[PDB]
């Protein structure tokens, strides 16, 4: 029926050493001065200087905003926007995971669309008339794929909720997908962000708006990620490079079609508790998959198959169970906590979390139409055994 749109990065560089392309890209574009948007951890760890050392050798000017925090808030966006406005910069370089990537998008959008100074009013299909300030995006987790999506997610601390901004105008001009930038994640962070990448690919494979091209991207991403994540957590170089590619491929799909109830149930955790996005999604994933199983056609057979299960001869019910179990197994293998209680959730908040999840935009993509009671029940199931 309806035609399907795809927004993608016009330019992207892939592989260990891809950040070495940045200075030429800047020179080709004629930009005069960057604002780097990042967090203090990435500065302390030397990750930012991997980029600035190259800029300095090429004679390219920059300034830094390093105030991003996980689950970046309206306060963070306003602070970074002020730094941008006083910096003399003409473009942005986002160095970090989803939290810096998203902050950078917000800054770049508001700078060219000042009617959105309050930040909150960007939620939804932001009616921006101008493209963002140009962004060069450098992910350091594997990851959110925020370098390739048209979305960014802000935490409204005053309202205790996360909100999603969807806007073609925010797409980065160039993405640099370089596992050298990602290797310093602690193993536990690799694990959570990697199962989050898997969640993007699984939810995107089964989302209501799925179509042929996104299905092809998502099923490839699932195969890459499921084959690489244990090795990446273990520190294998090639597995890290595979994770960097797979996490990105997932975004090429889900940006354009949507996610589901895993992300919808994780957003309130981020808002209520400041839970890390990756861990929250990882813990919820297999429970939501079980819930969705009967509403997914043949797709769990494909998921199980590319996660290593010999599905030949299984009934559809068996293949569905096998897909779920393969996710539980991966979570155990890479040390994801088994229960939400383990990561600071309170049972008393489940009613309110569930209403927030029901209302979350990601939930609308879920292949099964969730009810309040389904979400209450899933939180209890995930909370403790």
Residues 135-164 contacting ligand NAD, CB under 6 A: 140-141, 143-144, 146, 149, 151-153
Tokens describing residue 139: 């992910």
Q: Which of 267, 290, 305, 320 binds Cl ion (CB under 5 A)?
A: 267
3 state DSSP class of 155: strand
Distance in Å, CB of 352 to Zn ion, minimum? 21
Pairing state between β 33-39 and 11-14: unpaired
Residue 64 main-chain phi, psi, to 5 deg:
-125, 140
Which residue sits closest to Cl ion, CB atoms considered? Answer: 270
Query: Cβ–Cβ contacts within 10 Å for residue 112, how many?
Result: 16
Q: How far apart are CA 46 and CA 181, in angstroms?
A: 10
Nearer to a second copy by C-beta: 124 or 344?
344
Closest listed residue to residue 176, CA positions, set 204, 139, 213: 139
3 state DSSP class of 317: helix
3 state DSSP class of 229: helix
Asked if residue 42 binds ligand NAD (CB under 6 A), the reply is: yes
Asked if residue 266 binds Cl ion (CB under 5 A), the reply is: yes
Asked if residue 113 binds ligand NAD (CB under 6 A), the reply is: no
Q: Which of 81, 104, 148, 153 binds Cl ion (CB under 5 A)?
A: 153
Nearer to Zn ion by C-beta: 183 or 196?
196
Q: How far apart are CA 33 and CA 253, in angstroms?
A: 32
Q: Which of 13, 26, 55, 96 binds ligand NAD (CB under 6 A)?
A: 96
Asked if residue 240 binds ligand NAD (CB under 6 A), the reply is: no
Q: Which of 39, 196, 360, 374 binds Zn ion (CB under 5 A)?
A: 196
3 state DSSP class of 325: helix
User: Is 192 in contact with 279 (CB distance < 8 Å)?
Assistant: yes
Asked if residue 39 binds ligand NAD (CB under 6 A), the reply is: yes
Taking CB under 5 A as the binding criterion, the range among 29-37, 126-134, 189-197, 272-280 that sits at the site for Cl ion is 272-280
Nearer to Zn ion by C-beta: 142 or 322?
142
Asked if residue 107 binds ligand NAD (CB under 6 A), the reply is: no
Task: Kindly list the residues in this chain that would bind Zn ion in the complex (CB under 5 A).
Answer: 196, 281
């Amino acid at each position: 029926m309806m035609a399907n749109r795809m927004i993608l990065n016009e330019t992207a560089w892939f592989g260990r050493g891809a950040v070495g392309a940045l200075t030429d890209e800047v020179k080709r574009r004629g930009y005069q001065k960057a604002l780097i948007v990042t967090d203090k951890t990435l500065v302390q760890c030397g990750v930012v200087a991997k980029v600035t050392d190259k800029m300095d050798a090429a004679g390219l000017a920059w300034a830094i905003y390093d105030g991003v925090v996980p689950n970046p808030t309206i306060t963070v966006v306003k602070e970074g926007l002020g730094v941008f406005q006083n910096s003399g910069a003409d473009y942005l370089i986002a160095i970090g995971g989803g939290s810096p990537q998203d902050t950078c998008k917000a800054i770049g959008i508001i700078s060219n669309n000042p009617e959105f100074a309050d930040v909150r009013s960007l939620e939804g299909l932001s009616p921006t008339n101008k493209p963002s300030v140009p962004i060069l995006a450098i992910p350091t987790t594997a990851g959110t794929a925020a370098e390739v999506t048209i979305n960014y997610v802000i935490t409204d601390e005053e309202k205790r909720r996360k909100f999603v901004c969807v806007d073609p105008h925010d797409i980065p001009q160039v993405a640099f997908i370089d596992a050298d930038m990602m290797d310093g994640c602690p193993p536990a962070l690799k694990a959570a962000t990697g199962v989050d990448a898997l969640t993007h690919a699984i939810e995107g494979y089964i989302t209501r708006g799925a179509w042929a091209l996104t299905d092809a991207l998502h099923i490839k991403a699932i195969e890459i990620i499921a084959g690489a994540l244990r090795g990446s957590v273990a520190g294998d170089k090639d597995a890290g490079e595979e994770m960097a590619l797979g996490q990105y491929v997932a975004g090429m799909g889900f940006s354009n079609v949507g996610l589901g109830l895993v992300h919808g149930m994780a957003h309130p955790l981020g808002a209520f508790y400041n839970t890390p996005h990756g861990v929250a999604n990882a813990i919820l994933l297999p429970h939501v998959m079980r819930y969705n199983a009967d509403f997914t056609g043949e797709k769990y057979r494909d998921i199980a198959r590319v996660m290593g299960v010999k599905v030949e001869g299984m009934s559809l019910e068996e293949a569905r169970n096998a897909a779920v179990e393969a996710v539980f197994a991966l979570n155990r293998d890479v040390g994801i906590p088994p229960h939400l209680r383990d990561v600071g959730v309170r049972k008393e908040d489940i009613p309110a979390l569930a209403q927030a999840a029901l209302d979350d935009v990601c939930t609308g993509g879920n292949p099964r139409e969730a009810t309040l009671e389904d979400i209450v029940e899933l939180y209890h199931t995930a909370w403790l055994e």
